[PDB]
UniProtKB/Swiss-Prot annotation, chain A:
Subcellular location field: Cytoplasm
Known function: Component of the large ribosomal subunit. The ribosome is a large ribonucleoprotein complex responsible for the synthesis of proteins in the cell.
Species annotation: Homo sapiens
Location of N6-acetyllysine modifications: K47
Record's subunit section: Component of the large ribosomal subunit. Interacts with CRY1. Interacts with DICER1, AGO2, TARBP2, MOV10 and EIF6; they form a large RNA-induced silencing complex (RISC).
Protein name: Large ribosomal subunit protein eL8
Top-level taxon of the source organism: Eukaryota
Disease / disorder: Chromosomal recombination involving RPL7A activates the receptor kinase domain of the TRK oncogene.
Full-sequence portion shown in this chain: 171 to 218 of 266
Similarity section: Belongs to the eukaryotic ribosomal protein eL8 family.
From Swiss-Prot, chain B:
Recorded GO MF terms: cadherin binding; RNA binding; structural constituent of ribosome
Protein source organism: Homo sapiens (Human)
Annotated GO CC locations: cytoplasm; cytosol; cytosolic large ribosomal subunit; cytosolic ribosome; nucleus; ribosome; synapse
SMART domains to which the protein is assigned, alphabetical: Ribosomal_L15e
Covalent link Glycyl lysine isopeptide (Lys-Gly) (interchain with G-Cter in SUMO2), residues: K82
Recorded coiled-coil stretches: none
Entry similarity comment: Belongs to the eukaryotic ribosomal protein eL15 family.
Modified residues (Phosphoserine): S33, S96, S99
Identification of the protein by name: Large ribosomal subunit protein eL15
SUPFAM superfamilies per record: Ribosomal proteins S24e, L23 and L15e
Disease: Diamond-Blackfan anemia 12: A form of Diamond-Blackfan anemia, a congenital non-regenerative hypoplastic anemia that usually presents early in infancy. Diamond-Blackfan anemia is characterized by a moderate to severe macrocytic anemia, erythroblastopenia, and an increased risk of malignancy. 30 to 40% of Diamond-Blackfan anemia patients present with short stature and congenital anomalies, the most frequent being craniofacial (Pierre-Robin syndrome and cleft palate), thumb and urogenital anomalies.
Signal sequence, renumbered to the chain: none
Lipid-substituted positions (N-myristoyl glycine): G1
From Swiss-Prot, chain C:
Gene Ontology MF term list: RNA binding; structural constituent of ribosome
Organism, scientific name: Homo sapiens (Human)
Listed name of the protein: Large ribosomal subunit protein eL36
Subunit architecture: Component of the large ribosomal subunit.
GO annotations of cellular component type: cytoplasm; cytosol; cytosolic large ribosomal subunit; cytosolic ribosome; membrane; nucleolus; synapse
UniProtKB/Swiss-Prot annotation, chain D:
Annotated organism of origin: Homo sapiens (Human)
Annotated family: Belongs to the universal ribosomal protein uL1 family.
Protein origin, superkingdom: Eukaryota
Protein name: Large ribosomal subunit protein uL1
Modified residues (N6-acetyllysine): K91, K106, K118
SUPFAM superfamilies xref list: Ribosomal protein L1 (SSF56808)
Function comment: Component of the large ribosomal subunit. The ribosome is a large ribonucleoprotein complex responsible for the synthesis of proteins in the cell.
Length: 48, 203, 51, 217
RNA sequence: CGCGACCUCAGAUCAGACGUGGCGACCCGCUGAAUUUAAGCAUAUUAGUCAGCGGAGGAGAAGAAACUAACCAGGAUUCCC
RNA sequence: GAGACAUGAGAGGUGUAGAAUAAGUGGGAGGCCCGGGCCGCCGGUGAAAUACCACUACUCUGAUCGUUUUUUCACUGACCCGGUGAGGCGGGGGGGCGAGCCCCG
């Protein structure tokens, strides 16, 4: 959190490590990063 | 960079975060039993820089050692003869508690090899170490070079012959003028070489 | 011990602060450089609170 | 205590004089002082090496060293034109008599001679030793060769067994551009010897009728 | 008021493996005396030795400098003079 | 709470003829008072007197706001003791049996 704060990248604390792991097709995963996204979900980002 | 952040954080042991974590983990290791198998390394950066890899065949054992000095095991505190040998209480063991932790881990799981060990919190009464063990018959370990040296038979009970990192630190051998006591390979090798008598054929 | 030495440096008893840091870390060289780094920290936070 | 403003933001080091431009605050002439700041003293011990320097100030409060030089350095005495008298007139001068409104404590540093001092404290009035004055050699006032301690006659001080002293150098009516080489003597003449005492550096106090804050470190 | 996912644990005559004990001349890790000598004896010596405990291999340990040095410098370990 | 702790801070003493003790490290024969001063001082040759300029700090100070040390009380969560086949622990809801306790009808 201090690192993402200082670099100014938005970060969130999700409730569930297994939920991250299941979206990345493993058992658990610690963190997940969003890089650049296609045009039709840029607006979904631009609210979230 | 993540492991570098964990490394700096674990050097900052007297910070409030780390002293909280150390106290709570010390509490739960105290509630567990004396010899215990961990499901994963508590300190992964320390374990990997000590040799551990996340493969099948590397296991981690948490060992608890009752800390303090060594008391002489003589009845009623009576050693016999020579006041220089009358000592009972303030005596100290020649090896470290970390080395005896590795030795207890090896003696229980005597079919594995002790690679190394590190510290995971003490107490006033106990000291908790984690010992990296290796199964030397897993294929994932003896079907891969750079690690089948520990499957070779000259490495059985490294922690009992004194040649892990902690046991080597106890043996006290190095290079230079600090270490003349062990200048033939070991202490009694040096003692033997400088206390034998070379009686040549032509003297 | 760093925070207690920082209190000593805020009250500006620098000889006492050096003797204290030397008692905690053991060596005069390490104590001198720890004292200069804590004094740098105090000066930085002081000018930050000033501006 | 101090003056009215009682503030300083400078360190006022020994590589500094740079102070004193409105010391004449009121209409009168300020009795400027000079002191020493010997700290760390043990009251139950004895210490020595009295200080006696020539402090070039040319002041208004001024005594002299004129008594008595009994017919030996006449060539040195008639340049300043002393009242040249005898031992019976020294009986008059001293405070055994009751003649005129004369300051019995006029000159404490009397003239260092080798003749009259043998017979001063036997037939004269003991007001010399109750007032605590003696024509000794501390004053370095031989006054026989050409000129040593006659024309200026600096106000002298002493290093007793006491902690703090206050002896006035006198008056100025001027700036400190002669003081910049007049006064750097106290710290060196104290730290030259007797190192079972306080260290080198400290401030100095100058308080008077009105003592401006000039605590030269 | 259930259904999943992970974590942390448990059980099994589960599938496949591995350790134990012996020998111990040499090797490694501990532990470790007293006789003796000091013309007594306590530090010292005997001796980090005997006895005791553990672990090996055809050798073992050590080993590629947080070294020696102070020179015009040498250059892992082991062994011999 | 107490304790020296950062500190501010009113406050001085006599063997005594003294204009209290005119006392402490200060001492001009008056800065300054109205173009006057003053407890006194070369005029008890005076405890070094001291009409004045009380810078070292004088039996030295009630307290201020801070950092630091100890005493008592309380809490539980480490730690300890006991019991048990870890069997009803802590808080909370109605008609209510009885005080009728209660605006009281
Ligand atoms: Mg002996
Ligand atoms: Mg089976
Ligand atoms: Mg004998
Ligand atoms: Mg004999
Ligand atoms: Mg005998
Ligand atoms: Mg043996
Ligand atoms: Mg065996
Ligand atoms: Mg080998
Ligand atoms: Mg090796």
């Amino acid at each position: 959190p201090a690192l993402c704060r200082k670099m100014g990248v938005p970060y969130c604390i999700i409730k569930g490590k297994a939920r991250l792991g299941r979206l990345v097709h493993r058992k658990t995963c610690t963190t997940v990063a969003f890089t650049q996204v296609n045009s039709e979900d840029k607006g979904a980002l631009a609210k979230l | 960079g993540a492991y570098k952040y964990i490394q700096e954080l674990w050097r900052k042991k007297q910070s409030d975060v780390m002293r909280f974590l150390l106290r709570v983990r010390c509490w739960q290791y105290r509630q567990l039993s004396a010899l215990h198998r961990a499901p994963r390394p508590t300190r992964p950066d320390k374990a990997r820089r000590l040799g551990y890899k996340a493969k099948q065949g590397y296991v981690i054992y948490r060992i608890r050692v009752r800390r303090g000095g060594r008391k002489r095991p003589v009845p009623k505190g009576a050693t016999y003869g020579k006041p220089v040998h009358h000592g009972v209480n303030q005596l100290k063991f020649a090896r470290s508690l970390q080395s005896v932790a590795e030795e207890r881990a090896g003696r229980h799981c005597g079919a594995l090899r002790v690679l190394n060990s590190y510290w995971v919190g003490e107490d006033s009464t106990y000291k908790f170490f984690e010992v990296i063990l290796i199964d030397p018959f897993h294929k994932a370990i003896r079907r891969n070079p750079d690690t089948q040296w520990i499957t070779k038979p000259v490495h059985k009970h490294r922690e009992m012959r004194g040649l892990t990192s902690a046991g080597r630190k106890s043996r006290g051998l190095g290079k230079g003028h600090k270490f003349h006591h062990t200048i033939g390979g070991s202490r009694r090798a040096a003692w033997r070489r400088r206390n034998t008598l070379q009686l040549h054929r032509y003297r | 011990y760093e925070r207690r030495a920082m209190e000593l440096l805020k009250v500006s008893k620098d000889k006492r602060a050096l003797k204290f840091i030397k008692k905690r870390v053991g060596t005069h060289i390490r104590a001198k450089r720890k004292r200069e780094e804590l004094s740098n920290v105090l000066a930085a936070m002081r000018k930050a609170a000033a501006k | 205590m101090s003056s009215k403003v009682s503030r300083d933001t400078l360190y006022e080091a020994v590589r500094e004089v740079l102070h004193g431009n409105q010391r004449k605050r009121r209409k009168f002439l300020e009795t400027v002082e000079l002191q020493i700041s010997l700290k760390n003293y043990d009251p139950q011990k004895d210490k020595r090496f009295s200080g006696t320097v020539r402090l070039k100030s040319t002041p208004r409060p001024k005594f002299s060293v004129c008594v008595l030089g009994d017919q030996q350095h006449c060539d040195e005495a008639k340049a300043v034109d002393i009242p040249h008298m005898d031992i019976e007139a020294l009986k008059k001068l001293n405070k055994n008599k009751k003649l005129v409104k004369k300051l019995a404590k006029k000159y404490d540093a009397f003239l260092a001679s080798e003749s009259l001092i043998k017979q001063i404290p036997r037939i004269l009035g003991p007001g010399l030793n109750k007032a605590g004055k003696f024509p000794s050699l501390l004053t370095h006032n031989e006054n026989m060769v050409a000129k040593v301690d006659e024309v200026k006659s600096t106000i002298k001080f002493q290093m007793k067994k006491v902690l703090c002293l206050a002896v006035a150098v006198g008056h100025v009516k001027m700036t400190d551009d002669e003081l910049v080489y007049n006064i750097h003597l106290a710290v060196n003449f104290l730290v030259s010897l007797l190192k079972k005492n306080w260290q080198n550096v400290r401030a100095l106090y100058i308080k008077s009728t009105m003592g401006k804050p000039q605590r030269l470190y």
